Amino acid sequence: AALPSIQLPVDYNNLFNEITDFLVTFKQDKGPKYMAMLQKVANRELNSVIIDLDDILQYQNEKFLQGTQADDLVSAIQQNANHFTELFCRAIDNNMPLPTKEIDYKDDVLDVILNQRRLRNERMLSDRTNEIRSENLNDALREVVEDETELFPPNLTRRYFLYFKPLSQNCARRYRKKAISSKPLSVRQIKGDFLGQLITVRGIITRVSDVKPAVEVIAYTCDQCGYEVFQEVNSRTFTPLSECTSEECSQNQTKGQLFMSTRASKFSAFQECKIQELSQQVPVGHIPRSLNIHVNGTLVRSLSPGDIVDVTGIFLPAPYTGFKALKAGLLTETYLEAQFVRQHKKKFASFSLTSDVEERVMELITSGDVYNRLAKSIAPEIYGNLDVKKALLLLLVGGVDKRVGDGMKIRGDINVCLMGDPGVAKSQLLKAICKISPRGVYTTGKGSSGVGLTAAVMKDPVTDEMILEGGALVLADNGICCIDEFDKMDESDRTAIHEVMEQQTISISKAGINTTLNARTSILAAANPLYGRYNPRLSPLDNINLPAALLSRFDILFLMLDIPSRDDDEKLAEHVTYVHMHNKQPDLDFTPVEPSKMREYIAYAKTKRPVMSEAVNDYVVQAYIRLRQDSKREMDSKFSFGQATPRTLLGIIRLSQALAKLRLADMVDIDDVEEALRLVRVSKESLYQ
Amino acid sequence: APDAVFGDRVRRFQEFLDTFTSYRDSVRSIQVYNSNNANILPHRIIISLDDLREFDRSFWSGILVEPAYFIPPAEKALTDLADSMDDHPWKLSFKGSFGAHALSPRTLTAQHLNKLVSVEGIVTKTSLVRPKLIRSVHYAAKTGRFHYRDYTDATTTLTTRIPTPAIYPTEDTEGNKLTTEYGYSTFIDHQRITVQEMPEMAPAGQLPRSIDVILDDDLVDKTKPGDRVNVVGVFKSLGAGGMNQSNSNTLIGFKTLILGNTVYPLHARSTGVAARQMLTDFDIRNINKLSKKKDIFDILSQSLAPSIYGHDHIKKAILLMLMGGVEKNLENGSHLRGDINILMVGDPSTAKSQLLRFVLNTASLAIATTGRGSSGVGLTAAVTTDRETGERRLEAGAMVLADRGVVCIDEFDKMTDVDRVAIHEVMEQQTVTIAKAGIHTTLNARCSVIAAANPVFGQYDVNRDPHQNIALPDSLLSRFDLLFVVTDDINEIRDRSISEHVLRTHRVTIPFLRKYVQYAKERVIPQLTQEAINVIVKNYTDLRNDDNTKKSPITARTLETLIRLATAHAKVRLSKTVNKVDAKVAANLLRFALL
Amino acid sequence: APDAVFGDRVRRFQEFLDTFTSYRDSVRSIQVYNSNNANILPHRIIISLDDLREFDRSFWSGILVEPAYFIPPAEKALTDLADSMDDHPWKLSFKGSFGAHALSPRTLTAQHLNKLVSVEGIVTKTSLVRPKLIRSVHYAAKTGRFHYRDYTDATTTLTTRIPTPAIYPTEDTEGNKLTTEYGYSTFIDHQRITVQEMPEMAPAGQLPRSIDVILDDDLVDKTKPGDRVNVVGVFKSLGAGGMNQSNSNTLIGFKTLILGNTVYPLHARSTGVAARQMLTDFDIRNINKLSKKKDIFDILSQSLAPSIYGHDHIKKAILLMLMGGVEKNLENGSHLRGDINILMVGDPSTAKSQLLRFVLNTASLAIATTGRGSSGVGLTAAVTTDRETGERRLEAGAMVLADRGVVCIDEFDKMTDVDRVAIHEVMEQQTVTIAKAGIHTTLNARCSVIAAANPVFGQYDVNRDPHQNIALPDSLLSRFDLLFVVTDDINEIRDRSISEHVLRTHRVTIPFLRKYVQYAKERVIPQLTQEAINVIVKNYTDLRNDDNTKKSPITARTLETLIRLATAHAKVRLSKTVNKVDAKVAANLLRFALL
DNA sequence: GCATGCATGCGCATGCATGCATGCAGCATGCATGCATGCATGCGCATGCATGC
Ligand SMILES: Nc1ncnc2c1ncn2[C@@H]1O[C@H](COP(=O)(O)OP(=O)(O)O)[C@@H](O)[C@H]1O
Ligand SMILES: Nc1ncnc2c1ncn2[C@@H]1O[C@H](COP(=O)(O)OP(=O)(O)O)[C@@H](O)[C@H]1O
Ligand SMILES: Nc1ncnc2c1ncn2[C@@H]1O[C@H](COP(=O)(O)OP(=O)(O)O)[C@@H](O)[C@H]1O
Ligand SMILES: [Mg+2]
Ligand SMILES: [Mg+2]
Ligand SMILES: [Mg+2]
Ligand SMILES: [Zn+2]
Incomplete structure (x- = not known):
């Protein structure tokens, strides 16, 4: 016959029973975990449920090891994820406990409406039962009652979202299984055979659309019969109804006109994102490709x-959208549906103390010598350069912003310029810092210019509104911007960095745009003398091209020269040759700290905000007076990159605050200012050889 | 229903496969590999048209002239043999001489329709690999049954068939609702490409001709734009050329395209496709024997461009560049370069361009460029384009295509700062960074560079220091691993000798050299040794603390260059570790270059 | 494509056939016979619905209520079993109890549509057996190849299918002409009949109801008009009841009919179907044992109509008539009669009608008639009718239906000359001749006759000679082999005894007797013997040359009658030759009848 | 034997199922065209860069 039938090794009743037992039975190594979660959900302190597959695997293995049979719910979900969502939703709805907290005036309108709907359901059920019993024409009575009455379906009474998360490699390895759903893949490797599965993709984000309401069920109200009509929608477009469909209007001769009611509708928060390949995954001589991700609900x-992420999702198809003339059969377009996101570098803003972080941080601080221990751990394969490594660490930590009132503001970030002879690993340090930073961006001269920095006006494909796409500076907001070949930049770009490093904003006034952008970022610049190697026979300011004011506005400026020395050359050569012969550093008395723990400690330190007192103020003013008195004589002899100015005092203050924060103290101390002055002094040591 | 001629052709092709015994064992090997490893191999093999001609001329002509009647029988015979020999359907590909059926997009006319053809050209644009729906599966809630349906279209079969446009089911036969099973459905890939006549053969001043091609399943992503390609397939016509219905329009004709079934990339000079040769056991024995002699480096060095006189050190440097070093990546994520770079400055009749062209011709993957010929985006791939799908992206440039290969630059001094700054990053970090409106990416550009330049005063002057004679940024000169200076001085004996040599010309082989280079670069990766460590340390210290006037400055780049040269010489030696001899050769060559 | 439910049902029916082993050996026997005898047997088997119910009730109800989904699987299972067990498709027939699915054309309503039914009725009109074209074969002259095509219609399967109206091919695909091969094509028979409610069960004074039936292949010529038939089939509906297109007419409904799959003729009184029984080895042993007892004739004669008193000689005569003699045909083409005829004349309360009705009830094929009930054409079948094909033909009458059987005539003396002249030919030549407009034929009417008549004066009178009491033409009397005269004379003892016998009644079995007569009439054919020849010669001479006044004349018909009685008594004895005892018994019986 | 009445066959009117065409009118449908949309194109201006003086 037409539409034949086929037999598969899948039974849904057994799986549903197993789901119910799992939801009501699981215990982690207190009552059931998921039952407590449901209690919170009913009490209205949660919105999303996360189902982990490691729990399911543990449940299955526990059932097996003691003999009783169990099905491979893990494999079933992995292969046909999209179908189990409804099974889980129904299983949960069959078990949701009652609310233990009354509904008050400080609750959500959504919850109010849901409660009203449930009470109304109960009212019709009771009324129908009473009416039927009155006739004198209990399971049969109940059954006829459900059969002869209309209700609000469960989906219009649910209040929570449900998501899955993949199987951990550790758990699969311990249980002797192969975690397919948690093997990272590139957009290159995702082919048609993977459709309908739960898979993990590793990539870098490039574009994200704004949050907008996506409709799932439209609601209309009929004034004639007082009914509510619900129309499902699962397409990119739909058609509105005109005439009633309720039973009364259907039977009657005069039908009422439907109207639209936004509040009763069922909306979803929807975003679309574009993910792109990583450099190391692209084959030789090819261009990276992209992929589309959908995000729905509380995710x-x-x-x-700019985020480098691992996204778990269900791979689903979509209707074809290319030209008709190139269509050959039933071609389809693909996308990923998101269920779980894992970042490769945890943002500072999301910091929160906890036992696991506490133990590691206390271990590190107990080990002692945190300052030097961290400083030596930045790019440990580069020899020497301890002072610049310390300065870079202080730049990473940052200072303290100050809100002085009256609308004014004082920056709290540190700006560093390295200026050196060729072949001293400036680019290596730049790249290392950009990698260690959680929002670090990297740039090189003519590669990016104009709208590459700042932002440009474009039109969103998803929505029909105009938007601004940011450049490197906006992408590096609340982070580090690393610039190579600083002196080769164009005048417009130089002015852009000027204004950013002045007041953390970028003003644009051009055809079709009149606005200001926020660029709360730090600057780490690299530069090379104007004649290649430094010429001691010429003044420092004539040895460089950038404007003296631009040099001055930097908090820290380092000069790096290559003076041959038969002693230190031996040490450097031994270091480099050891680094090549192995893949590790040579020192054995020092153990470097990994970027994860470094980020942990820096994030913790950023929570502090030390303050300044009178003794330190007196010391600072005396030091500033002495330094300002001295610098004027040097500048007169044309042997200084710049005269001392109040920006120097502000830089000293910021460095002292950063050192205090690193020490993890609310109180600043004289030794911090001592170290800051030591650094700012040694900044120009090589100029006096 | 069964057809007598169809069965007869099946039997005849079965006899062919029986008389020839390579394809049976090939199929057995494919099945054995798949069974053992469960990666999976496709169910396809290749046949020799020459063998077919020798066996049965009638069947040969039948396949060549009427594939629609002769291929499906052979495919069925192959499938039957595979299913019989084993403890999806299989497919066929063709190699051999096509005689008059080897054409080009310009010489492909309507008289070749429905006949198997082989076209050569350059890929101009590919399409996005999309899945195609074949079989759909559904589940019934009220009954607990699984239903399915099948689909097909015009391009999946050679013989015309009566359309059967089955609809997508949403209800059961009884009226119940249906649920879809995406994981239990079946999808197949599908791509479309365009091929154009090569620019080395197309008429000049005349617009080019192009032809479409459709690929399916396991032939879906075997090429990229800009490749030289040879495609063997069936040239077919589809649809009705406006005949059906009135269709008053008469201008349009019949749609045509190729149901491609074999695709081959071809190597060419100044192209992104690398050359690769198959190595035989005789080749391996010969190369391994040759490696054991003591003057192998000298022999290989002299083998290069024997038509030119002298320049032994430059020949050795070119060989070292070809072999290359080794690059290191640390767990932190740091990258350490392993390529080599060469610059030559000399008098204007010293065969600089000749050596440049020789390296272009012999290198497996090389791209040639001149000073002002390519500028701006043409070098860094900084151009942006977009299709009708709305998405913008990049298309590769000189150095980007040159990844893992060689770039020859002629008239080097003629460049500008806008692109010298750009090439700084390529020569040191071996990456390219782009940031335009809506694009922020990074492209790997791991390539080596050979360049030639002229002195400022026409002829090299010995009365001035090298700075005035070269006049190039010191930072740039630092990035080049080796710099050579060559001057022609008149001398009766040398002039005599070059005269006899040139007159001789005017009245080891390269292929074996290429095989040697391929094996050496693919198989062996040596490691450092303490002896070499000490030798390099001593030599670098001496150079840094010597007062002699040099042509180039000294940095840590010199130490890294010494290490790279030692490793490359070890690679030439085919040893697993660098040695004192290799270190000394590297030091001696560097000293000769500098002094 | 394959269907899971179809496969499950096939496997279940396979299990049924495995558990029940009779059908397997039946199929093996059919194949054995068809192989050995090359007449060919068809591929059809009968299944028991009772066994199906006992095995699987759900499957039983499935077949009963939805045959369209359950039968084809069973047919496929049977075909598979046959093709597996052997060293066309096969078909099924159903017997057993149909419960509420046994109906009649009056009680057959729309609620039974698509359900397996069993109807009973009388065949009213059959149709002409025509061949149906299935597969056509053609030959191409220009190319020397044979093509073919297949055809189908709506009535060849239970399940609906998408129409595929292929056309008759006259040309090749290339344009060549084609020549048909009538000898290599394939044709199948086809017939349509109509069944009506029985006349003994339909309400009196009401018009009857009828239903059509379609038969195909080997069920094509199993019945004739006027027969009692039970047909088991599938009640089905075809076409669209004017729904498609406008078709403004609403009076007509859906066409319906039965795709019959089993046909059974049934025996009834005064009907053209002969009754037959199946003889078991127990039956044969009992009959053969009984054969050896000396008083077998006496016991058999007494067994008939034990409710009546006396008439022993008449019972003997009726038994002799039932057994019958032998008819002879010579190489010349002459025919010699072998039947017997009986006439009874008696007083009006002598159970004549009772004996006559007993013979009607017991004889395998008997037809009953009254004096004036049937007249003219009704006896000789001389009626002429025609269909819409335009041809005229004959439809059989009483004696024509009575071929090889018995005719009971009651109130014989009320007939007329016009039909007594007709019956003369039937009694003597055993043939009927008709010569009407466009009809000149001759029908075989080999039947025996038993008749009863009343004396002229109400009661037989002994004071007058037999002629005045009988008053029938001497020619007619000569044709009756035996004539009996029976009178009731009052007598105290006889009246007493008949009284007790009748009162006893008012307060060997027949089936075994019927089996006995069937076996005797089918198996034994005796021959004449010189002893009987001499005895009959002497008896005939004496009778012809005696002076006693007889009740009937004497001719050579009397000698032939002696022969027939002797042969029939030998048949009763189951001896292969007549004997002196049989001759003497025949002579004694005839002498008693005449005197 | 002789006269009548009933059945029976012959002849004369007529209605009635099949099967076909023809003029006609109705109804789905292709076809003219009316349009917004998104895209690529060239088309000058501002200007950073290289060159000559
Ligand atoms: N102090 C050092 N220790 C180890 N390697 C170094 C050091 N200084 C320079 N190098 C090497 O020299 C190269 C300098 O390249 P780069 O990082 O671009 O610096 P620059 O821009 O000054 O040339 C690097 O590849 C690095 O490995
Ligand atoms: N060392 C040499 N031995 C033989 N021939 C040479 C040598 N140097 C130059 N020539 C000849 O002189 C010509 C130089 O051409 P070209 O390579 O264009 O000059 P250049 O490279 O110096 O610009 C070549 O055709 C080559 O045959
Ligand atoms: N010899 C007999 N033995 C028993 N019953 C007889 C006998 N003769 C007549 N009868 C009874 O008398 C009735 C005669 O009915 P019927 O056969 O119509 O009379 P007839 O045959 O003389 O015309 C029957 O019902 C039968 O039972
Ligand atoms: Mg650098
Ligand atoms: Mg040249
Ligand atoms: Mg009677
Ligand atoms: Zn309504």
Whole structure:
């Protein structure tokens, strides 16, 4: 016959029973975990449920090891994820406990409406039962009652979202299984055979659309019969109804006109994102490709441009959208549906103390000598350069912003310029810092210019509104911007960095745009003398091209020269040759700290805000007076990169605050200012050889 | 229903496969590999048209002239043999001489329709690999049954068939609702490409001709734009050329395209496709024997461009560049370069361009460029384009295509700062960074560079220091691993000798050299040794603390260059570790270059 | 494509056939016979619905209520079993109890549509057996190849299918002409009949109801008009009841009919179907044992109509008539009669009608008639009718239906000359001749006759000679082999005894007797013997040359009658030759009848 | 034997199922065209860069 039938090794009743038992039975190594979660959900302190597959695997293995049979719910979900969502939703709805807290005036309108709907359901059921019993024409009575009455379906009474998360490699390895759902893949490797599965993709985000309401069920109200009509929608477009469909209007001769009711509708928060290949995954001589991701519900706003992430999702198809003339059969377009996001570098803003972080941080601080121990751990394969490594660490930590009132503001970030002879690993240090930073961006001269920095006006494909796409500076907001070949930049770009490093903003006034952008970022610049090697026979300011004011506005400026020395050359050569012969550093008395723990400690330190007192103020003013008195004589002899100015005092203050924060103290101390002055002094040591 | 001629052709092709015994064992090997490893191999093999001609001329002509009647029988015979020999359907590909059926997009006319053809050209644009729906599966809630349906279209079969446009089911036969099973459905890939006549053969001043091609399943992503390609397939016509219905329009004709079934990339000079040769056991024995002699480096060095006189050190340097060093990546994520770079400055009749062209011709993957010929985006791939799908992206440039290969630059001094700054990053970090409106990416550009330049005063002057004679940024000169200076001085004996040599010309082989280079670069990766460590340390210290006037400055780049040269010489030696001899050769060559 | 439910049902029916082993050996026997005898047997088997119910009730109800989904699987299972067990498709027939699915054309309503039914009725009109074209074969002259095509219609399967109206091919695909091969094509028979409610069960004074039936292949010529038939089939509906297109007419409904799959003729009184029984080895042993007892004739004669008193000689005569003699045909083409005829004349309360009705009830094929009930054409079948094909033909009458059987005539003396002249030919030549407009034929009417008549004066009178009491033409009397005269004379003892016998009644079995007569009439054919020849010669001479006044004349018909009685008594004895005892018994019986 | 009445066959009117065409009118449908949309194109201006003086 037409539409034959086929037999598969899948039974849904057994799986549903197993789901119910799992939801009501699981215990982690207190009552059931998921039952407590449901109690919170009913009490209205939660919105999302996360189902982990490691729990399911543990449940299955526990059932097996003691003999009783169990099905491979893990494999079933992995292969046909999209179908189990409804099974889980129904299983949960069959078990949701009652609310233990009354509904008050400080609750959500959504919850109010849901409660009203449930009470109304109970009212019709009771009324129908009473009416039927009155006739004198209990399971049969109940059954006829459900059969002869209309209700609000469960989906219009649910209040929570449900998501899955993949199987951990550790758990699969311990249980002797192969975690397919948690093997990272590139957009290159995702082919058609993977459709309908739960898979993990490793990539870098490039574009994210704004959050907008996506409709799932439209609601209309009929004034004639007082009914509510619900129309499902699962397409990119739909058609509104005109005439009633309720039973009364259907039977009657005069039908009422439907109207639209936004509040009763069922909306979803929807975003679309574009993910791109990583460099190391692209084959030789090819261009990276992209992929489309959809985010629905409470998982929105979890992705921002420039993030390197692992996204778990269900791979689903979509209707074809190319030209008709090139269509050959039933071609389809693909996308990923998001379920779980894992960042490769945890943002500072999301910091929160906890036993696991506490033990590691206390271990590190107990080990002692935190300052030097961290400083030596930045790019440990580069020899020497301890002072610049310390300065870079202080730049990473940052200072303290100050809100002085009356609308004014004082920056709290540190700006560093390295200026050196060729072949001293400036680019290596730049790249290492950009990698260690959680929002570090990297740039090189003519590669990016104009709208490459700042932002440009474009039109969103998803929505029909105009938007601004940011450049490197906006992408590096609340982070580090590393610039190579600083002196080769164009005048417009130089002015852009000028204004950013002045007041953390960028003003644009051009055809079709009149606005200001926020660029709360730190600057780490690299530069090379104007004649290649430094010429001691010429003044420092004539040895460089950038404007003296631009040099001055930097908090820290280092000069790096290559003076041959038969002693230190031996040490450097031994270091480099050891680094090549192995893949590790040579020192054995020092153990470097990994970037994860470094980020942990820096994030913790950023929570502090030390303050300044009178003794330190007196010391600072005396030091500033002495330094300002001295610098004038040097500048007169044309042997200084710049005269001392109040920006120097502000830089000293910021460095002292950063050192205090690193020490993890609310109180600043004289030794911090001592170290800051030591650094700012040694900044120009090589100029006096 | 069964057809007598169809069965007869099946039997005849079965006899062919029986008389020839390579394809049976090939199929057995494919099945054995798949069974053992469960990666999976496709169910396809290749046949020799020459063998077919020798066996049965009638069947040969039948396949060549009427594939629609002769291929499906052979495919069925192959499938039957595979299913019989084993403890999806299989497919066929063709190699051999096509005689008059080897054409080009310009010489492909309507008289070749429905006949198997082989076209050569350059890929101009590919399409996005999309899945195609074949079989759909559904589940019934009210009954607990699984239903399915099948689909097909015009391009999946050679013989015309009566359309059967089955609809997508949403209800059961009884009226119940249906649920879709994406994981239990079946999808197949599909791509479309365009091929154009090569620019080395197309008429000049005349617009080019192009032809479409459709690829399916396991032939879906075997090429990229800009490749030289040879495609063997069936040239077919589809649809009705406006005949059906009135269709008053008469201008349009019949749609045509190729149901491609074999695709081959071809190597060419100044192209992104690398050359690769198959190595035989005789080749391996010969190369391994040759490696054991003591003057192998000298022999290989002299083998290069024997038509030119002298320049032994430059020949050795070119060989070292070809072999290359080794690059290191640390767990932290740091990258350490392993390529080599060469610059030559000399008098204007010293065969600089000749050596440049020789390296272009012999290198497996090389791209040639001149000073002002390519500028701006043409070098860094900084151009942006977009299709009708709305997405913008990049298309590769000189150095980007040159990844893992060689770039020859002629008239080097003629460049500008806008692109010298750009090439700084390529020569040191081996990456390219782009940031335009809506694009922020990074492209790997791991390539080596050979360049030649002229002195400022026409002829090299010995009365001035090298700075005035070269006049190039010191930072740039630092990035080049080796710099050579060559001057022609008149001398009766040398002039005599070059005269006899040139007159001789005017009245080891390269292929074996290429095989040697391929094996050496693919198989062996040596490691450092304490002896070499000490030798390099001593030599670098001496150079840094010597007062002699040099042509180039000294940095840590010199130490890294010494290490790279030692490793490359070890690679030439085919040893697993660098040695004192290799270190000394590297030091001696560097000293000769500098002094 | 394959269907899971179809496969499950096939496997279940396979299990049924495995558990029940009779059908397997039946199929093996059919194949054995068809192989050995090359007449060919068809591929059809009968299944028991009772066994199906006992095995699987759900499957039983499935077949009963939805045959369209359950039968084809069973047919496929049977075909598979046959093709597996052997060293066309096969078909099924159903017997057993149909419960509420046994109906009649009056009680057959729309609620039974698509359900397996069993109807009973009388065949009213059969149709002409025509061949149906299935597969056509053609030959191409220009190319020397044979093509073919297949055809189908709506009535060849239970399940609906998408129409595929292929056309008759006259040309090749290339344009060549084609020549048909009538000898290599394939044709199948086809017939349509109509069944009506029985006349003994339909309400009196009401018009009857009828239903059509379609038969195909080997069920094509199993019945004739006027027969009692039970047909088991599938009640089905075809076409669209004017729904498609406008078709403004609403009076007509859906066409319906039965795709019959089993046909059974049934025996009834005064009907053209002969009754037959199946003889078991127990039956044969009992009959053969009984054969050896000396008083077998006496016991058999007494067994008939034990409710009546006396008439022993008449019972003997009726038994002799039932057994019958032998008819002879010579190489010349002459025919010699072998039947017997009986006439009874008696007083009006002598159970004549009772004996006559007993013979009607017991004889395998008997037809009953009254004096004036049937007249003219009704006896000789001389009626002429025609269909819409335009041809005229004959439809059989009483004696024509009575071929090889018995005719009971009651109130014989009320007939007329016009039909007594007709019956003369039937009694003597055993043939009927008709010569009407466009009809000149001759029908075989080999039947025996038993008749009863009343004396002229109400009661037989002994004071007058037999002629005045009988008053029938001497020619007619000569044709009756035996004539009996029976009178009731009052007598105290006889009246007493008949009284007790009748009162006893008012307060060997027949089936075994019927089996006995069937076996005797089918198996034994005796021959004449010189002893009987001499005895009959002497008896005939004496009778012809005696002076006693007889009740009937004497001719050579009397000698032939002696022969027939002797042969029939030998048949009763189951001896292969007549004997002196049989001759003497025949002579004694005839002498008693005449005197 | 002789006269009548009933059945029976012959002849004369007529209605009635099949099967076909023809003029006609109705109804789905292709076809003219009316349009917004998104895209690529060239088309000058501002200007950073290289060159000559
Ligand atoms: N102090 C050092 N220790 C180890 N390697 C170094 C050091 N200084 C320079 N190098 C090497 O020299 C190269 C300098 O390249 P780069 O990082 O671009 O610096 P620059 O821009 O000054 O040339 C690097 O590849 C690095 O490995
Ligand atoms: N060392 C040499 N031995 C033989 N021939 C040479 C040598 N140097 C130059 N020539 C000849 O002189 C010509 C130089 O051409 P070209 O390579 O264009 O000059 P250049 O490279 O110096 O610009 C070549 O055709 C080559 O045959
Ligand atoms: N010899 C007999 N033995 C028993 N019953 C007889 C006998 N003769 C007549 N009868 C009874 O008398 C009735 C005669 O009915 P019927 O056969 O119509 O009379 P007839 O045959 O003389 O015309 C029957 O019902 C039968 O039972
Ligand atoms: Mg650098
Ligand atoms: Mg040249
Ligand atoms: Mg009677
Ligand atoms: Zn309504």
